[PDB]
Design an enzyme around this catalytic site. Structure first.
Site, short mmCIF file in Angstrom:
data_model
loop_
_atom_site.label_atom_id
_atom_site.label_comp_id
_atom_site.label_asym_id
_atom_site.label_seq_id
_atom_site.Cartn_x
_atom_site.Cartn_y
_atom_site.Cartn_z
CG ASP A 78 38.81 40.29 35.30
OD1 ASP A 78 38.74 40.29 36.54
OD2 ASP A 78 39.42 41.16 34.66
CD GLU B 238 36.60 45.16 30.80
OE1 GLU B 238 37.39 44.22 30.81
OE2 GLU B 238 36.80 46.23 31.44
CG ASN C 152 38.69 40.76 39.72
OD1 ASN C 152 38.96 39.66 40.12
ND2 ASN C 152 39.58 41.74 39.72
CB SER D 79 41.09 37.70 41.05
OG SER D 79 41.68 38.79 40.33
CG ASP E 211 44.88 39.62 41.79
OD1 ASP E 211 44.37 38.88 40.90
OD2 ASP E 211 44.25 40.54 42.32
CG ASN F 31 42.56 39.70 37.00
OD1 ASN F 31 41.45 39.57 37.62
ND2 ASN F 31 42.63 40.13 35.76
CG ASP G 9 31.36 49.33 45.38
OD1 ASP G 9 30.62 48.99 46.30
OD2 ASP G 9 32.60 49.31 45.45
#
Ligand SMILES: [Cl-]
Ligand SMILES: [Cl-]
Ligand SMILES: [Cl-]
Length: 129
Positions: A52, A35, A59, A50, A48, A46, A101
């Site tokens: 990280d 990562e 994110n 967003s 879209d 990203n 999650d």
């Protein structure tokens, strides 16, 4: 901060990540390696809109607030900048929520693509833990 491999493993262990949700320390170190290359300051946009953040590339779409991800949540109740600190506490606390999650460490696509199923023990090899 750019951690050494065993240095990060130790820090993760000190913060209760060792075997958290059944994920051994090597899994967490491997995820961090791919990562962020162990760099606490890593940020990546990203497609879209967003971003990280940090050692585990958490994110802003769901987990932290950066003020520029429209429609997003802040489920870790933290500014995304807190995920860039030298001290990994905030990233660990938030990672614990993410991994709980439902999909385990599959939440981290680099873990799924590069760590899952591999000899993750190699990441802690030689470390005085
Ligand atoms: Cl390494
Ligand atoms: Cl391991
Ligand atoms: Cl936002």
């Amino acid at each position: 901060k750019v951690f050494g491999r065993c240095e990060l493993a130790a820090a993760m262990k000190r913060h209760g990540l060792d075997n958290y949700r059944g994920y051994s320390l090597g899994n967490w170190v491997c995820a961090a390696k791919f990562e962020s290359n162990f760099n606490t300051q890593a940020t990546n946009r990203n497609t879209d809109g967003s971003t990280d953040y940090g050692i585990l590339q958490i994110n802003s779409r769901w987990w932290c607030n950066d003020g520029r991800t429209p429609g997003s949540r802040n489920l870790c109740n933290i500014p995304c900048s807190a995920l860039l600190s030298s001290d990994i506490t905030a990233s660990v606390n938030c990672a614990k929520k993410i991994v709980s999650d439902g999909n385990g460490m599959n939440a981290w696509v680099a873990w799924r693509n590069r760590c899952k199923g591999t000899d993750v023990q190699a990441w802690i090899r030689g470390c005085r833990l």
